[PDB]
Assembly symmetry: C3
Homo-oligomer: 222 residues x 3
């Protein structure tokens, strides 16, 4: 179409779609109850992202938000995505280490707060206040990071995989607040097509890359 | 009112309302923890549908979607309904056979995808793309059907009831994609008042009929 | 700002924000898995309410609903709040007494119905029908009250705390339907600024007061 970012939304759609089919096939032969859990969570993450990448591609997941003078194009569908896929990615981490349910409920709820405040900030018409919501969301993000590092005798199959996925998680998740801030939702420093490319690379890596490291590990079997 | 389908929405409201009160009363005397589970899930399905049938009756759950030339009346409230009642109906099936949590998470998430893509398709303003969302939703539907047949030593109380409810589920659920397709959301082949009658018969049977077969069975007790 | 209720929204924001930080700190040193559960649920309730009080403060969580002649200001964000915090408050009660999952699913679903019908009623443009939704919502409220009293050998640490929190819950929750009814959502008897003060006192007490009684009790430890 007439949106230069179209290409990145198309590529994202395609990579999430093929990741989903790859993990669907791979989990084909699994009967270990624990492994099945990791396969369900992990296949669903890019299947959901596939649908929201498609909706942005076709224009459904775009709206116009007036602020600081202009009519700003905001991809809201990303927050419908993340609202479900980010807790699921935290659940993969949580089950891996056999987390207490109280830590799991802290993680999923802090994550909800993160995305939902992210979404408010994305849709807020008073420019200055958009960054008060960014800050609140970043604080929930940093609570989550804190818990993944200080919130938790695992078998070494689990600890090595956990540590890797944990490192991947903090490095990539921590880049989203930065892209938002300098992108079209925030200061408007980086154009939307570049932003959309940044978010596509993070999203494919955080979902499909993350899942490839997880699902190739023996950590997931009981 | 001035909507010919009003009658079917009124009848649906009434039948869901009486189903809810019937199951509420029936579960009155239950103390078996397992049976209580089946009674909670099963009573809630038509209580939620009661509220969304009422909202369509009163006009709240209707919006206008422009596409292929016209201003199309779309009952969106059906998707608020299904978003919660269809996973609950799958949970009744799942608990019955003592499903692994990984199979339960695959079912509920595939179901979310099904309804949420159904909803996108219902609200999409580009006529051709409405059927790309229909197709994606039908694929999640067929994954669910596949799992109910190939995804799963139960006591014979469970297997006989499970098989029946399973058969009821595939026959009725599989008719929704067809009604949508030829109805006002799709090709516009069947008028909205006839569509609304079709959806009312399916919905009462899939919820109240399904629950009557379930809740009259000894399969639900530990 | 130019809204007289601004002050109560500001005070509510501040009290929910300090409650959240207080409970965050207090739960700092907890390792008992059961206590951690109570701390997660209980800290999250005012953290979520903090964000929705802020959004009403800044104007995001306000919309205009035309009915009975006028353009009515409706704070919708309260229902985004309650949709999650009221089930969490019921979960604190439920875990305390070691409730059956079927009773927990009845509680959370009745609560969803309560808030979601509350929200429909708040946004309904036909004045008379707003009170049909109020009535349906009040009925779910009374089902919840019934279950907390008749739905359930606990150790006396639990029974004393449970009884207190239970009493707090019915007295304060039962006042919300009254405030709505005579406030701006309903008959328009009490002005919006007074209503907003009423809701702020109930909300701080039902969340922060409730949590102080809970989290100071030994009932929460295994
Ligand atoms: C718990 C635990 C954690 C909860 C944390 C609390 C955070 C609360 C924030 C939330 C508030 C929701 C915002 C939304 C309701 C308000 C929509 O208004 C928009 C902006 O004015 C409309 O314009 C533009 C329209 C835009 C539409 C946005 C839609 C979004 C989609 C994601 C929801 C989906 C749900 C599945 C549907 C199938
Ligand atoms: C840090 C702690 C909270 C600090 C808030 C203080 C700021 C006081 O704001 C006044 C300065 O004129 C006026 O705001 C009133 C005019 C407008 C209000 C905007 C400021 C308020 C929205 C501040 C509310 C709390 C903020 C959230 C900070 C995020 C934190 C959770 C990381
Ligand atoms: C994608 C971005 C744009 C580019 C950033 C890429 C740089 C990645 C740096 C590697 C780091 C990952 C950790 C290395 C691994 C080894 C860690 O294993 C340790 C042993 O258990 C774990 O302890 C503790 C582990 C420690 C983990 C440190 C994580 C890092 C800190 C997070 C920074 C983020 C980068 C922000 C991006 C930019 C756009 C702001
Ligand atoms: C740490 C606290 C306790 C938590 C609360 C933090 C909330 C942050 C509030 C941000 C707010 C001060 C933004 C002020 C905008 C300022 C750059 C310019 C103000 O008026 C400008 C000129 O008319 C707006 O032009 C528009 C020009 C725009 C391109 C300017 C973009 C704004 C940038 C915002 C940067 C926020 C981050 C740096 C926060 C860093 C941590
Ligand atoms: C997980 C696991 C599974 C998730 C699968 C991903 C599927 C993502 C699709 C979802 C996207 C949500 C669409 C919605 C947010 C967008 C609303 O925009 C509409 C159409 O432009 C507005 O017009 C018309 C307005 C219409 C309004 C529709 C409302 C709907 C109501 C259902 C939600 C309710 C939630 C409970 C509230 C109480
Ligand atoms: C089957 C596999 C996916 C097949 C997609 C291929 C179709 C390529 O579309 C091009 C044909 O001109 C252009 O689309 C670009 C113009 C517009 C794009 C519409 C087509 C894309 C939305 C196709 C994206 C995938 C579709 C989803 C198919 C549903 C499947 C999950 C059952
Ligand atoms: C309501 C519709 C409009 C009308 C369709 C009604 C026809 C119903 C046909 C009966 C079928 C149900 C199965 C019969 C029972 C016996 C099955 O028990 C078997 C033994 O364990 C289960 O194995 C495997 C069981 C097999 C199950 C087959 C299910 C059927 C296939 C689904 C078709 C659907 C119909 C589509 C409706 C139309 C509008 C497109
Ligand atoms: C299997 C794939 C891998 C998955 C992807 C499938 C996506 C389906 C794309 C459907 C798309 C081709 C619809 C094309 C509309 C076509 C009938 C007419 C095109 O232009 C018409 C004349 O201006 C529109 O008039 C309007 C007249 C309308 C009344 C026509 C209604 C359209 C009908 C759509 C039928 C779709 C189903 C038959 C799919 C069957 C499987
Ligand atoms: C289960 C178990 C229990 C379910 C019980 C069934 C109850 C069904 C009722 C629900 C229906 C939802 C209503 C909503 C979808 C319709 C929005 O339309 C509004 C009024 O016409 C728009 O105007 C004004 C806009 C207003 C916006 C309201 C937004 C609300 C926000 C709460 C949702 C949030 C979700 C988290 C997002 C992050
Ligand atoms: C008590 C039981 C249900 C009682 C409903 C009966 C009321 C019949 O309504 C007719 C009176 O002219 C017309 O309504 C039709 C015109 C309009 C319809 C408004 C009335 C209907 C919406 C009533 C539907 C049920 C009500 C819900 C009552 C709440 C109950 C769950 C506590
Ligand atoms: C905030 C409102 C505006 C003002 C209402 C404040 C009055 C509070 C009255 C105290 C009551 C609480 C119960 C007292 C305690 C003792 C109960 O312990 C009993 C022994 O196990 C529990 O059995 C059973 C316990 C019994 C519990 C009775 C609860 C009361 C009944 C609920 C009424 C509500 C008030 C409605 C508010 C008004 C605005 C309509
Ligand atoms: C128990 C049943 C089985 C369950 C169903 C209950 C549903 C309640 C339906 C309420 C409905 C009759 C409201 C009627 C409005 C009536 C006061 C005035 C009618 O027309 C008025 C004059 O043009 C509207 O002016 C506007 C003036 C307004 C300020 C009037 C406010 C209306 C008040 C509504 C009171 C409802 C509660 C008293 C219900 C009590 C239980
Ligand atoms: C699959 C997608 C992933 C892992 C996305 C993660 C997104 C975040 C961690 C987003 C965080 C944000 C904040 C901390 C600041 C406000 C804006 C957000 C939502 C982009
Ligand atoms: C109580 C209601 C039930 C059991 C409704 C079930 C609805 C479906 C199985 C709907 C499926 C659809 C698709 C597969 C295609 C797109 C449209 C839908 C949502 C009607
Ligand atoms: C933290 C907030 C709490 C505990 C809020 C509880 C709110 C209710 C119990 C609300 C009930 C309502 C009805 C029963 C009638 C319709 C309107 C409502 C949603 C205000």
């Amino acid at each position: 179409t007439g949106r230069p970012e179209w290409i990145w939304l198309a590529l994202g759609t395609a990579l999430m779609g093929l990741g989903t089919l790859y993990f669907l096939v791979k989990g084909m032969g699994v009967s270990d109850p624990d492994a099945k859990k990791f396969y369900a969570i992990t296949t669903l993450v890019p299947a959901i992202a596939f649908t929201m990448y498609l909706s942005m591609l076709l224009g459904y997941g775009l709206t116009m938000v007036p602020f600081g003078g202009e009519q700003n194009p905001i991809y809201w569908a990303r927050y419908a995505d993340w609202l479900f896929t980010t807790p699921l990615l935290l659940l993969d981490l949580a089950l891996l280490v056999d987390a207490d349910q109280g830590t799991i409920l802290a993680l999923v709820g802090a994550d909800g707060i993160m995305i939902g405040t992210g979404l408010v900030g994305a849709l807020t018409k008073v420019y200055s206040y958009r960054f008060v919501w960014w800050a609140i969301s970043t604080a929930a993000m940093l609570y989550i990071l804190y818990v993944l590092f200080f919130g938790f005798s695992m078998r070494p199959e689990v600890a090595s995989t956990f540590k890797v996925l944990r490192n991947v998680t903090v490095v990539l998740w921590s880049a989203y607040p930065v892209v938002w801030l300098i992108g079209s939702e925030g200061a408007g420093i980086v154009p939307l097509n570049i932003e959309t490319l940044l978010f596509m690379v993070l999203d494919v890596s955080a979902k499909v890359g993350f899942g490839l490291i997880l699902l190739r590990s023996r950590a997931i079997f009981g």
